[PDB]
Design a protein around this ligand. Structure first.
Ligand SMILES: *C(=N)N(Cc1cccc(Cl)c1F)N(C)C(=O)[C@H](Cc1ccccc1)NC(=O)OCc1ccccc1
Ligand SMILES: *C(=N)N(Cc1cccc(Cl)c1F)N(C)C(=O)[C@H](Cc1ccccc1)NC(=O)OCc1ccccc1
Lengths: 305, 305
């Protein structure tokens, strides 16, 4: 039936993306109700970034310096405040398309859809995971700051990410919609690097279950294992420790496939130790860790919105 | 800056997806203006499929057997015709959300976005390619038939695919929005199989250019090559022949990176002959052929909608 990395439908979010310009910098904003949220470093010049005192820099800001544009319409700014690392630009016009929404701070290992935009016009949509080191592997060019990541939980858009930064290592850092960075990152042009990027073990197992459900089963072994034993091989290969909570989460997948979680851990142990010998699982020559158990069950059932 | 497999924003298409039920079967339809397009095998029972005479089967169809549903609203059927392998269900209500659109029949090797739906509610969005053997590798569960693939060309939604079939080999077959299957496939429950799936050579090179643009450059060699010579190694590995037109298409990528196309072909030759030796390009251990030169330039510039 198939298994692919897919994003949520982005309709509800498209009509929330505006353009924000401050001086010579232009990036994306998120317009919900009468507020436009964007990264506060829109007010810095390439030189301010080396050591910004955002509060002082913000004193020098008139609403007139903030030119917000919804496609072609231009919006009115009747105030501007700062919440952590995001600017809250109050406007008079409530977005007639504001969806039911929450702001959620997601956990490392969880996934969201990113709607990439350039100058307030959506460009594409793709799925990301919040790595254990609080980075994401996305596609953000110049003009992409302000793009948001989100999940559609039932009838509600849960905003969880706004793009701010590219690390000189080529990965991406950002904040929740309250302006708190994920990870130890600061919006200053200084030496910062991502910590060791470990692999999300619970997700790899959900992917191996997704593979079993889709006929790929050459990795299923007769061996079995215990949590403690498996977590030794995991630590060796910079894999995340597998807790009992993680096994409980894989319950429904174990039930559907008829393969105890610890039996799947036995298969993963051998793949880490011996490799794929040139076979592929669901089309990859590598172990995939950016599907949650919930991404899998969702795709192997048929949940809609 | 990043390179990811991303779909077009699906907002314009979401509000075009309805639910169609005929008897015991329910699948998705596409409602543009006053017409609902869906796969004609919605009228067959699991038994009719072994040898359907769709024209006769359609005689026995009253509009009353066709229950169309837009989310919760129910639509009126004032006629029903058949164009090749798609039913055109005329309704009285024009979709107030019909976007500017064309119906395009895409070429093998080109990509489109699929909006997967289950019972007329969109589930997710992902990018596919039309393989050289006129199949696609997607994610279509029960209830997914009728989901469409599309490209957003400027201001126009170009519909190019509607899902009909899963081959017993696990790949997917479907039609253009005029009801003509891609490939030699028929909507009958009989022995049919996909031909040899060759690799889209022009796309792999666009991906290797995308990789160079993103700092991955360990594959760039001093060797060079000619078209004829390279196409010998390609044929060997079930790769598509590279024409001069394909080299002209890679022009803009060659220009941006400063690497003649034939020099990139020299790199691909060595990767096919020797393998990756455990390195990765843009995060894959395998050569990716589902990005067109246009998908790449689009992501390495910043084209929006
Ligand atoms: C957002 N509009 N955007 C522009 C952008 C996009 C892709 C790559 C780069 Cl290099 C780029 F500038 N971003 C990511 C930025 O404007 C940020 C702003 C910033 C700068 C410094 C610290 C925090 C935020 N630019 C950025 O991340 O540049 C890379 C960088 C990061 C840290 C230290 C030096 C350089
Ligand atoms: C669409 N609603 N859908 C249901 C569906 C989804 C995933 C897997 C399967 Cl097996 C499945 F049935 N499809 C793909 C179908 O309804 C088609 C209808 C059909 C049947 C036979 C020939 C053409 C079209 N089912 C299908 O492709 O089943 C697989 C198959 C194909 C060919 C021969 C035998 C079986």
């Amino acid at each position: 039936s198939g298994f692919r990395k897919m994003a949520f439908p982005s309709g509800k979010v498209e009509g929330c993306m505006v353009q924000v310009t401050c001086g010579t910098t232009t990036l994306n904003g998120l317009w919900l109700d009468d507020v436009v949220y964007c990264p506060r470093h829109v007010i810095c010049t390439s030189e301010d970034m080396l050591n910004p005192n955002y509060e002082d820099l913000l004193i020098r800001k008139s609403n007139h310096n903030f030119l917000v544009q919804a496609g072609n319409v231009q919006l009115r700014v009747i105030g501007h405040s700062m919440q952590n690392c995001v600017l809250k630009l109050k406007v008079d016009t409530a977005n007639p398309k504001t969806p039911k929404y929450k702001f959620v701070r997601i956990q490392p290992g969880q996934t969201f859809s990113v709607l990439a935009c350039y100058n307030g016009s959506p460009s594409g949509v793709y799925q990301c995971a919040m790595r254990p080191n609080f980075t994401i592997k996305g596609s953000f060019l110049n003009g992409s700051c302000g793009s948001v990541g989100f999940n559609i939980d039932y009838d509600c858009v849960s905003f969880c990410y706004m793009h701010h930064m590219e690390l000189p290592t080529g990965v991406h850092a950002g904040t929740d919609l309250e302006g708190n960075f994920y990870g130890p990152f600061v919006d200053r042009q200084t030496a910062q690097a991502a910590g060791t990027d470990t692999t999300i073990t619970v997700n790899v197992l959900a992917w191996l279950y997704a593979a079993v459900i889709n006929g790929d089963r050459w990795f299923l072994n007769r061996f079995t294992t215990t949590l403690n034993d498996f977590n030794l091989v995991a630590m060796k290969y910079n894999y995340e420790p597998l807790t009992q909570d993680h096994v409980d989460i894989l319950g429904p997948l174990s039930a559907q496939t008829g393969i105890a979680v610890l039996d799947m851990c036995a298969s993963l142990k051998e793949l880490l130790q011996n490799g794929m010998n040139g076979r592929t699982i669901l089309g990859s020559a590598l172990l995939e860790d950016e599907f949650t158990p919930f991404d899998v069950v969702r795709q192997c059932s048929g949940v809609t919105f």
